[PDB]
């Protein structure tokens, strides 16, 4: 696959894609 | 964090899996 | 605000907008 | 859960807010 | 809730979310 | 251009692309 | 209306253009 | 306008309701 | 219609919109 | 990665994320 | 094809990768 | 390419059709 900049809603879209059913956490403060 | 890893820098799909549950 | 009918990635989008810098967790059943 | 409820029924931004960190 | 930068299609997505059934106007010229 | 089958936010997206700087109004029934 | 037509049937960018400002 | 309010600056979800019909 | 900046996933969304059934190629290297 | 159920523009989005700088072709039946 | 399969059934990112350039 | 035409510069919907199959 590739490496792109994934920001904002696009990041969370990517997480949704990658993780799907497993779910994910989006935690920008870290 | 994910934002530094993936937005600020670049990350792979594999790296994005780090943030799955 | 109105009630929402949100499937798939649209939910993750709505969560992203609603939570912002707080982030969120996406936890589907599975 | 919230994922299933929003999709099969409806849900509110106020319910969605409970999933914020 | 939060305050983020909402631009472009992301703005109109947010408007769709917030307003839904009521509808909205997206009028960038003002 | 082709004919479009556009529900929910996908319509608002299509309106955004089609209208651009003109903006648009989204007016559902309801 | 346009919202219902695009979703239940189909619609054109040319029809969508009528909703521009 | 909305773009200055919400894109240029930041706006809340509540502010975004200003642009509902 | 209009002319906007269409980048990234937004470009490919626009291509999907314009082309639909015909399909398209998204080939950033050129 | 998980299996994906992707219709319409969501497929083009997934292709975009998966392919990145390589780009892709979207070729529906038709 | 991939477009129909992903939508009517399911598909993998690995299958989607075959459509990269 | 499309990115220079449409992202770097601006392009119309009509120009975007150049990239249909
Ligand atoms: Cl963006
Ligand atoms: Cl959908
Ligand atoms: Zn974007
Ligand atoms: Zn969708």
């Amino acid at each position: 696959f590739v490496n792109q900049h994934l920001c904002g809603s696009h990041l969370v879209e990517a997480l949704y894609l990658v993780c799907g059913e497993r779910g994910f956490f989006y935690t920008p403060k870290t | 964090g994910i934002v530094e890893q993936c937005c600020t820098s670049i990350c792979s799909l594999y790296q994005l899996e780090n943030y799955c549950n």
Side-chain angles (χ1 to χ4, degrees), chain A residues 1-27:
Chain A
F1 302 87
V2 297
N3 299 350
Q4 52 213 294
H5 284 99
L6 288 170
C7 301
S9 56
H10 302 288
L11 186 40
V12 293
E13 291 264 3
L15 284 174
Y16 170 80
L17 203 74
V18 162
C19 301
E21 39 204 308
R22 307 180 261 192
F24 62 87
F25 55 96
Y26 170 56
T27 312

